[PDB]
Each structure stands twice: as C-alpha cells, then as structure tokens.
Amino acid sequence: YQRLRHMVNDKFQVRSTGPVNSLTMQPVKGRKRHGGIRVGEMERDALIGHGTSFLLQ
Amino acid sequence: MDISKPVGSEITSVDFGILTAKEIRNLSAKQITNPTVLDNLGHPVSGGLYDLALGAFLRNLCSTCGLDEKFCPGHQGHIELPVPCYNPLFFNQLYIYLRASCLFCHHFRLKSVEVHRYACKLRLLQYGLIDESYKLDEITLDISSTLLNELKSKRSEYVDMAIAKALSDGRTTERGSFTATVNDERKKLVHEFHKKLLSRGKCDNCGMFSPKFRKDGFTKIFETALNEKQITNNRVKGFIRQDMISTYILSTEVKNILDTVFRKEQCVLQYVFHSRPNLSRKLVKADSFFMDVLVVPPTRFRLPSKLGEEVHENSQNQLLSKVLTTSLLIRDLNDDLSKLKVSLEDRRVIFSRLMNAFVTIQNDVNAFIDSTKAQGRTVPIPGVKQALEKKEGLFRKHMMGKRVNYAARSVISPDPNIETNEIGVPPVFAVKLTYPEPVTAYNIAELRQAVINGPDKWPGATQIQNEDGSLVSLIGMSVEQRKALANQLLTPSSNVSTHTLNKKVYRHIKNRDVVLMNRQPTLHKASMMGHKVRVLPNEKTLRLHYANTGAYNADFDGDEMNMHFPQNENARAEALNLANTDSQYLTPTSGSPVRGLIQDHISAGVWLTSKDSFFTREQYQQYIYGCIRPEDGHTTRSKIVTLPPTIFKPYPLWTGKQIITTVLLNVTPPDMPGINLISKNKIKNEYWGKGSLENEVLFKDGALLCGILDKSQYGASKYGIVHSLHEVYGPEVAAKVLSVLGRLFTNYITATAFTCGMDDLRLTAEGNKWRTDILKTSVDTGREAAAEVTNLDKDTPADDPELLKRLQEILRDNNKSGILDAVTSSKVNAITSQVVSKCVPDGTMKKFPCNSMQAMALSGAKGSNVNVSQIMCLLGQQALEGRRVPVMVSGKTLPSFKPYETDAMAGGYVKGRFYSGIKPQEYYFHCMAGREGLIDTAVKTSRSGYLQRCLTKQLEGVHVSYDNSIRDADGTLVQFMYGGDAIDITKESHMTQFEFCLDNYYALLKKYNPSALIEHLDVESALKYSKKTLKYRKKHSKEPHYKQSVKYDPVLAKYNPAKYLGSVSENFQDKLESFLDKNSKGVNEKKFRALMQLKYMRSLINPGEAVGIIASQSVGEPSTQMTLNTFNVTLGIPRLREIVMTASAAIKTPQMTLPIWNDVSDEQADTFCKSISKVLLSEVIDKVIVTETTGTARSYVIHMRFFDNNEYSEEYDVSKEELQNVISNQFIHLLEAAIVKEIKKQKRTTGPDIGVAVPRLQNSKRLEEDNDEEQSHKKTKQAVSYDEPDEDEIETMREAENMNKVQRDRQSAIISHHRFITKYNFDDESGKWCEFKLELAADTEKLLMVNIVEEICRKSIIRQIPHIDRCVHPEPENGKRVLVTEGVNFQAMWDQEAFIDVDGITSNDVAAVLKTYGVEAARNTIVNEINNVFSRYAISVSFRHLDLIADMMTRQGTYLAFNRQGMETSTSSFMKMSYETTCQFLTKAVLDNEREQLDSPSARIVVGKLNNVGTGSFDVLAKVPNA
Amino acid sequence: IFVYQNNITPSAMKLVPSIPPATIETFNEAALVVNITHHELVPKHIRLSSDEKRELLKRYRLKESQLPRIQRADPVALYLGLKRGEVVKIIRKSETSGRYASYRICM
C-alpha cells in the first residue's frame, strides 16, 4: 500500500460572524480570514425550488 | 436580522429616473473643486474628494451629520462641470433625436400627422388596449392643413373616448394596465417610430434639408455639409420664412437644438418616454441626456484599499481627480476668453481652443462612467459601468448570490450509525455556530446551563443580548461571571421603552437544530436539503449517511459539503418541513426515489432474508434492539413486540425474513393495518434451486412471507418495499424504515461479514472446457467475415492474392473499412455472447449465493454480469470510436501481426480474461479502448450549466396560483392547469397502481381521512358532469379529432379538483373505469372508485409550488448524463440547445416524417423516395474525356460517358429526356460562366507578390493539469453560478439579429443560346453518352478543362424539390409505415396526397411547423422533440415540465428562446439587469420611466423583499380578542 | 374571402382594410390545398363569444393581455378569421391528462 501525499481537509472552515467588505457589507472571502461561504445563483435557484422563501431571506 | 427589531415601513416599488442638475446642487453636502485629496501633514483638503462633509474619514468626525466612521452613512457631493457633457449611457438616444430633427422649424422631419399617429397609438398603449391602437389606423378621411388638423382631431377624439370607456370598466386603472404583450406592442412602436424618424431626409413640415450628423466610437458629433442640390433648396424656401415672422458641433449646440425640438415635440415624447401614464405631469426635457454636474459618491464608497501594510489609492478618486483638473483648466480658458475683443477675424483658433476644452472634459466624464468609451492611455482604470459588470456583475456576484454568516465547510465522511435525516457535526463547528435563542420561562433552565458552560463547553453559549440591544460576550469571562449573568437572564426590564423585549442567548448548535446541507453543483433542489444536527465527539469531518449519497450526487472520494445554520424559527420550520431530507424521497423529475441503501446493506439483505438464514431467541432479539431503540423514539408501541418462532420443535428458531417483519411491526403505526405488496427481485428463481418462489417479494399484513430483498426493494428503486411503505404510511415512516434497515444490515455485516476473493473468480474444469471449445471457433470467424464483405465464394484462403488486393481497397476507404469492421464485430460478439451464456453461471466453480462476485452483480450492490464475464470469460472485441482497432498504411494493426491479417485477434478481439491474464497484443488494444473513454471526457465542450441558467432566470417567477393555474411573477397566465390535471409528480406514482391501492384499501382510507373533509367538498356535481363528457366521448370514438364534439369540455375545466370529488383528468377516469371493468373481485367497486377519486384529490400540486424552477431543474440536472458523444440527426445537449437556448429557424438536421398509406407498397414507396431525393449530374456520370486539340483555336472535345440508361433510371428515377434538358439549359451555361471566370482570373493576377509578407498558417499550466489536479481546484471552489458558456455556446451567441435532321435543328438552336460551343450530339436512342465541342480564342491558351468540368458536374442539379436533399425509407417506427426526409417543405408534400397522409406529416423543425400549421402545432413539436432527446438516453422527464417549458416559449404566440432576445418581453427590469448587460437594461428602464413592481424573484432579492413563491404566496394575520 | 391564384398587386393589397365594418380576407389556393385544422398536431380551436370571453376573464381574474397569445397572422387564426381581442378555446390531448382546455387571445 501507498500513502498519497494530499491532506484533503485543508479547506475545513466555520464562520458565525466574521469580517465584511466595506462596499457590499457582506462576509469577506478567505478561509483563514474567518471568511464566508458563498451561496451562489444555483443555491438561490434551489431555495426558490423548495418554495422556501424564509431560507432564501 | 433581529426579531426584537421589527420594521413598520416597506418598499413597494422602485421608480427609474434621471437626476436633474438643480436636484443634485440642493442635496449636495459639499462642492468638490480640488484635484488633490490630502493637505500637508495628512488632513483632507477642503473642496477635495476626502472632504469631511462627504463623511467621517481619518479618525475625524463628519462635517454634515457629526458622526464617526461607524455610524456615519456617508454623504453625496457634486462636481460643477464648466461645460455640459453628453451622458455616455444616453448618448445613442440623444443622437437618434438629433438626426431625426429639422434644424429650421425645430420639429421632427416626419410629418406632424404621422407623428401624432404614433403619439395616439403610444397613449392608448399606456393603458392595456392594443386592439384600439390598431383600430386608430382605420381612422382615415400634398394634403391641406385644414383637412389634416381634422384627422388629428378625430384621432384624438377616439383616443379620449377609448381611454374613458375602458376606464369606466375594470379594463384599465388611472395608473394604466401594463403586461408583457402590452410591452411588446410598445417596444415595436417605439422602434418603428425611430425608424420612420431617421428615414426622412427632407423635412415634411417645412421642405428645407438639414445637414446630416455623423458619430465616432467616443461621445462626439460632427455636421456634414449639405450638397449644392440641397443648398439651392434652402434658398427657394427662404422667402416663406419671412412671411411667418464635415465640422465638429459643440455639446451646447446639440443641447440647444434638442431643447427646442423637445419643447415643440413634447406631445409625442411624453408617451415615447413614459411606459405608463405620466401622473407626476413632469416635463420631458433634453437636459436629462446632458450632464451639467457630476454626483460625488460618499467617502464611504470611495475608501482607499488597504492590503497588509500598503494603503492603495481608490480608482474612483483617481478618475474623479482627472475631471477636477480639466474643470479648473476650462474655468481659466473661459476667464481668458472673457478678457479678450475688438480684434478677431482669425476665429478658427478660438473655436479650436473650445473644441479641445469640450473633447477633454467629455473624455474625463466618459472615463468615469464607462471606460470602453474613453481614449487609450499609454489596462485603463474601470468606470462605474465596469464596476457593475466586473466579471459576472454586481447583481450576479453580490445580489443574486452572497457570502453568508453562520455557515461551515468540510470534507464529508460516511456514517451508517446516524439517522438518514441527520448530519454528523464536528465539535469544532458546534462550539462556533450559535443560534439567537430568546430567554423565556419555559427555557430559562436550558439556557442558564449554556451560559454557565460558556463558548468552549458544548452545549454552551458564545454571547448574551440584553433587552436594551447591547451584547455581552462570554468569551473572556470565567465560570464566576457566567454564573452571575445566568441568574440575571429572566430579570424584568426596568425601562418601559424595552419592557416588550426579553434577553437573547447566542447558544451553541444543539442536537435539535436544523441545518442546510449543500453539495455543489446544486443542479436540483435535492442537492440542498435540511438535516438534523447530531454533534459527534472527537470528529474533524462532516459525517453523512449512505441514503443521502444519491440526491447530493456526492461520493466519499474527498468531496466537500457546505453547512448553513439558519438563524430564525421561520427559516427553521422551512428546513424541517419543506426542504428537509424525508420530504425529498422522490425527485420531481420522474417521481421516482433518490433515497435508499447503496452497497454492504444490499449484500447483507440478500444473505439475511435468505431461506438458509435462521436465528436463536438471543440472536433474534439482539438484531431487533440493535436497529430499533425505543429511547431514541424508533418504536410506535413503547414496548418491543416480537413474533413467535417459525420453528418450535426441536429448537426454537426465527427466520431471517421474520426480523424484517418485526422491524416493520415496531416502526409502522399500531392503529393502521400491515402493508400488502406483491413485488419482484433482481435475483431469478433459478439461482435459489428447484421450485423456489424467492423472486416473488410477498408482504401480507406487514409480513415478509416470500422472496429476498434486493437493491429493487430498499434501494432508490420505484415500487419497492420502502416506496410502498412511503405511499401507505408516509415519508416519516419510510425514513424510519430506511434508518432502521440501514442499522440492521450494518450490525448484521458486523456479526456476519461479507467478502470477495479468487474462489469467486474461478470457473470449474467443466466450465473452462466449454470456454476453450467455443473460443476455438473464433479463429475461423476472422477470415469468414473478411471473405463475406469482400464478396468471395467457397471461402477463399487467408493468404489469397485476390483477397489481399480486395482488402487493400477496403483499407483506403473509411466507409468500406466500416462495413468490414461492423460485420466482423457482430460475428465475434456472437461468439462472445455464446461463451458468456454457457459459462456463466452454469460453468462457474463457486456459485450464488456463496460466489460473492456473482452475488454483488445480481443483487445490484455493485457491478454487472458484463464485468463478471470480462473477469471469468473474455474481454471481447475492443471497440474504438464505434469501429475496431486502428490500422496502419501498411495494412498492419500492430508490428506483430501480418499485413492485411484476417484474424479476430488482429482486429482487437480479446479471447483472454482478467483472471488468466491478457497477451501483450490484447494489452495494447485494451489500452487503446480504455484511454478512448478518458479522451472523450477531456474533449466534451457540451455543458448543462448555461442551458439551466437560461431556463431558471426566465421561469423563477412561474408558480402554482391559489386558482390552480400556472402564473408568472407578474400575474400573467402561462398555463390554466399544471400538465392539464394539477397533479404533483412526487404523488403521481401509485395513483394508477389500483391493485396495490385495493390490497391496502383500509390502510389508505385511514391515511386519506375523509370524515374531516365530507362537509367541505361536493360529492355529485363533478361526478354527474364526468358521465356527460364520457357520453359524448364514446359517441365520437371512431370520428377524427377535428370532427369531435365541443359541447361539454373536460370536468377539470368546470370544477375545482380540491373542492369537487370527481373532477379528475379524463386519462385517470379512463384508466380507473377500465380497471373496474377488467377486474371483478369487503370492498365494493363503487367505494373503491371514491377512494381513488379522493387519492387524486390528495395528489394535487400545492398553490405556491415553484413549478418554473422545478421544470428547468428537471430538464437541466438529467441533461448532464448526455454529455458523451454519438456511438445522422442532432442529439443530446446540441439538439436541446437548438430548441430551448436558441429556438433556431435554421436547424442542423431538418427532417420530415411522411406517413405512407397501406395501398402504397414497399417497392412503390422506394420509387417515391427516388422521385423526391435530389439528383446531381455527378451521380449519373461514369467518365468524362476531354480531348484538348489546338488548331487553326482551342478545341475542347468533352465526351460525357454516363452509366447505362436502365441503371440510373432504376437508381435515381431519372430519364434520358430529363438528362438532355439539364445539359442543354443548365450545365453548358454554368460551364461557359466558369471558363470565362477562369480566363479573367488568369489575366488579373499574373503571380504572387515576392518580398511582401503573406498571412501565417496557424492557463498553459491548467491545460497540463491531470483530473486529480483539476478536480481538486473544483473541490475547493464555491461556484459563482452554472459553469460557463465559453465553448461552442459563445460562438453561437456571436450572431446578431453523321447526324439526324431533328438533332441538327436542336444543335443550331443551342449554338444561338451559347457563345462558345460549336457541336452538340446526345445519345437519344440508347441514352449512354453526350458529346459537345467547345471553341476558344488563340489568346485563351492553356486551361485545366477536366478539373473545371468535374466541379460543375457535382454543382449541376438534374432534379431537386426545394429545401429537400434526400428522402429515405427506414424500418417502421412502432408499427407506423413512414418516410424520413432530409429537408422541410410541407406544400410540396401536400401534392403527394396519393402516397402521403397529409394530416400526419411530422417535422422536427419547430419554426417551419409554426409558419405553416400554427403556434399550437409548434408547441406540440417542442414537447415531442425535447422528449426525443431524453427518451434516446433512456431518461424519463415528466411531460408536465416539457408542457410548461413549451407554453413559456409560445406565450407570445411566436417561438421564443431562453436567452436575451426572448427575455426582452418581460416586465422586471431588475430580473433583466441580473441576467446580462446590466447598464443596457437599466438605460432602457430609465428611458421608459419604468416602475419596478418588485414582483419577480430577482427584483425582490435586489430590494431585500420576501420572495412571493411558496411561503411568500400569502400573509399571516393574528386574531386579537379585545375590540 | 378572396381566393387569389399567384399574387396580388401591392396597391390592390391596400384596398383590403379600406371599407369598415366589412372585413376582407385573402387566401392563396396553393396554401388551401390541405386543411391545417385536419392535422393531428393542430387541436380544436373554437372562437369564443364576447360573453364567453367575459366569463373566462372573470373566473381567473384575468386582463385581456395577461392571457397566452395567438398571432393575428397565425395559420389557424387566419383560418377561423380571428380579430384582435377575440379569445380562442383550445381543446388539446395531453399524454398526462387527456382532453385539456387551454385558451389564447388574438392580438
């Protein structure tokens, strides 16, 4: 057996309330910077899909 | 968001307009005049971009609101432009109005009566009345002014009357009615108006010509001088003026021209610029297109970017400083201009100084707004247009999608010990993710502990919010302070201003919380479900159960998942009751399951439920409690009930099947009876020995009495045990059964393991003998097939010289090699099938159930009988791109094989298996075929990302209304009923499973409780009507669809399905009645009818359901499975793109399906095929001999040697007479034109230019990245949207909207019609040749006549029916005798009534069908064609989705596609702005003076309003008792 | 109804909507060779009375334009001789519900 060099849990992150960009006032990008997880157009579409308006809000 | 902080005011609508200079000057906090931003020392300079009046900056307080950097919102300022500038966004429009106006009378050059006609039509369109706008054109009486003014009066009279009449009724409000069709009619007119405006040259009012205005890329206009004809026109029309009383043009001159024109033509422009009536009564002024000032955004939005230590200057301040420098310079130029003047004459310099001053400030203004409109500087600084469209745009990157708080990301790890509806949360996330829990009397105990525990001990609390609004962090505090604060949580509020409020505790995520689990790409809503939090100690990864693997399309290969923690109870309720996992058992795509156990559990079940599996009392009870724990709420009886043993004497023993009976007996409700189901298995009875019935799955009163349980029962498979349980007991019970079975099989696999080894791969000595004997016949097959394709009798030897010459002919042709490959492959594959059928399983040493390799393939746990046969028998023929192994120019498939070898092995046929090993030749051939697949995965530009993105943006608003109809976001009706029956796809499964429903009558009667409904519905109205429709339907059964009765329409059209029992689809009615007739079986046939009627009632789609998104997701998500290439017509994603994305009128493969009669024979139909198929001269010619002889004149003797007369007449249906006409009329005229062109081309360019350069013949690390290197980047990136169209889609978007006497007379007549021929003799008797002599001049010299003739022959058409290339006769499709055409022309086929049934002539071309047969026919073509794309890849998509998509494409009565063009006719400008060309759609919105009603999902997201779909489709009001 | 053979003069075509309330409809005999409403893909289109339209706009609380559209120059619209405002009832066979009544407004 061979052990592959990669440590897959390198992008492991958690954010409650971290820093925000001045213009958008939205969670700033950066795992190590206590950054936010992006909810993109597809996730927006999925939340519209369930008809789950408060989850989208 | 704080529930303690409610909001009383709300934005209902957004109005688009232009800021006036007077307006900006008043609201401005400070006038910006200085280009410097900082004084010396470091303080902001007064009158600069960092002035403190624009807000708090550099630890200084704001000089307007007095607040610091935190609380100061920032304030707007202004720059005073020394000269007016053209606003870049509205330059194109002001340009249109400048070119359209007269420079003398200062009216538009179009006649006033024609202008008034547009003003009238546009006024009537402000209100929703299109019919009246067209009826205005009917009002009709070089024409006198007294007559034309009466026409304007009569037209105005009709306009005022039509508005008042419609205003009296509920046809239009005072604010005016506005629909997409109304918008379409407005957009058409405003376009036609500007087109007519620009077309006029000479002014129709005063006959004087105006000088034409030209433009460049940048905002700058020039005036082209008039011609002498137009200058003399000004002179003669100069006297009539008295009785009534290229050069650059400055911005002021243009503004002054438009100022008077906008005053004089105010009446039409009032309706040209207002979408709805102008109730504000504002004047339409020209200065809206001009900028006399520039607003300076607050310092807050222009802060200098800080990256580590370096503080970088803001790019907007840089662009603004440039505008300030130029403004100070023009102020000096105007000051020097003011000084001096008596001395002038040379005024060419003062205008030159002015032109520079104007073009410089304009450029600085342009550079600030839109950089791609400014001059090149020696990458430029981005403008405000560029800021809104940086990449995807501000709307897409920061409005439609956003980075969120209270969310986590981690690699997922499998876990069978957690519930199927749960998520294993690492304690790392549990101590950081908190919920704002308000402290009350019922939860004071729970939260006091959390407060004491603090932010590092779970379940704790990170913070506490007091009723005054302040926050108290528990992070730095010790156990002593936390204990004190906990005893202060329920203290009464002293302040009367906050007595209403109560404290909040920001408590750690507990095991009772909801979380949103997401696995990207989120192709369908099942990839974003609600999971129950289960904090697992000593964990560093997110734990997920195997039942969730399908829906997320997540494999535990190092995948990543996003966890979202919603922060309010409304969001909680939604994630627990709507988006929760258990409510996502069935996908809305086909209504089939996406939840079930995957591998070990399937193999465990086949062993556990086997007859041989027996268990003692101790063993049996252990397996029960092992998976069912009453303390975890798994039971329904509060005591574990147990069945008696199946064996009493000698020893008490329980069967394996009894464990399955006991699990159901403890998880299903006691009040309801047991499940009754007769299903089947994947494992055939033959495997279980003689006379076994172990394939028949039998459940009688919730007891497994016969058959084992496969992937077909507790996997994600329709009509299995779990699905049957789901229909009878609900989704919560089915979820419990899945988790219970999941535990049982995990525990069973721990006590009784499952393994795979070499013993499972071996054949017996008998079985291996069969293998060698069948494969011994395969050696002959190679040469046999080679002798068949080559056409050689008695089967010639492998080394035959004639055969080897014949195989060479095959080698050089791609088609000939294809015939050889397909024949040899079919023959060797027949030998493969024989080996496999004999050896597996009757020849395997170890046999099922013990042969685990065999077991896994049969159970559906993993693998198939094909994989099993490659392992134990042979790999077979290695197929490469539909053919065999590639062959070299030498005729060798490898250097080891003989040239033109007639052997199966040489062609790639592998006799070897993976157990015994594969030979080096076979190894290399396997390497070829193995790689071939991975190459296809590398070269596959087709993506479902953009296709789904286009559908979802146009269908987002489309949902189910409370009146059961399918309505868009703006209330416009799309469908009158969902799929014409209003059924939810996630319910339409057992609705036709009548026998199932009958066997479970009392179980379902208890489920669909009618006792609490009988008082709310009607039991006869619809049932009586259903009989009346059935009566008239049976009367016209044999009659055609056009002759059918229209007296009574369907029962669903007249009676609400949720209020009237019996208002069911005629499809359901016919199916239900047919069951009661064909099956005569204490349930009556009348009481069963009522139950099924009630089942349909309870299967209705809920009002609010986003059927739009669901439809696009149901077309998008499965279109990912058809990314692979063809194994003629366009298939997969390219064909789907031709329909949905581009709605092409020019299809790649246009076809026509012609249904042939019964009286027309197979020979007659083939003769008919030839009669329509396009025939070329090339197709009938065998040889052309050109005898170039130069004498006296270049003589060219062209002899056309055709095939025999009877040969081409039987192959193309072409006569000798037909050939004569084409050569004598077309071919010679085409040949003469080609020779003349070749003589000119010879004398034009003598040769290529020597020394002069000619044109050349023809991310880097990313393209060299392997799949493990490329998927790792996708593994970490959280996608902005739906992939990218940068492939073929971008290039598709690159399209903007001795001779006889009779023979002598014939020759002489042809000589008079052709300039170069001398002789013309054609075979009239036999019809085999055509000879003609061509005479050329002595100066024409050398020419390549053969090559010239050749090219014209394949260009000459003998016979062709317009737009049709070839008509073929395929195999009868589903019993229907049809002919497939490679072209479309209905009117031509209409004349072939003797052969074709003109009422059944199908066509794939939607646009062609629309043009001839109408919108409803095109609509039916869309639903059929999209279905053909999915049915080919064996993908089932509900017609309810396709019908909705088709209805949306045909909403305008035309064929609209899901793209920028189709979208143009949509109410929401915000939806349009968030799709593409944000500034362009915004400009169109402002110019229309549009009101965004905020009714589209996109618009609501933009303004932070709750979406109107689902939970937002109503309002919640509280009932209060006191008066 | 005026059934022409090959073509009509552009000057003559202007005389068609010149005499209201009388309406003139032109048809090419080559285009009338086969009836389009007889085709399997063309459902039964029925023109509704001013009262039937009035009732439909009430049941669904619709505005004329808020309905699915049929072009005035659509082959079936030209067949039944539809005028702008006239609502047409379409009885279409579905492979999910069977007979289904849908509607379209001619604009």
Ligand SMILES: [Zn+2]
């Ligand atoms: Zn301020």
Ligand SMILES: [Zn+2]
């Ligand atoms: Zn004029």
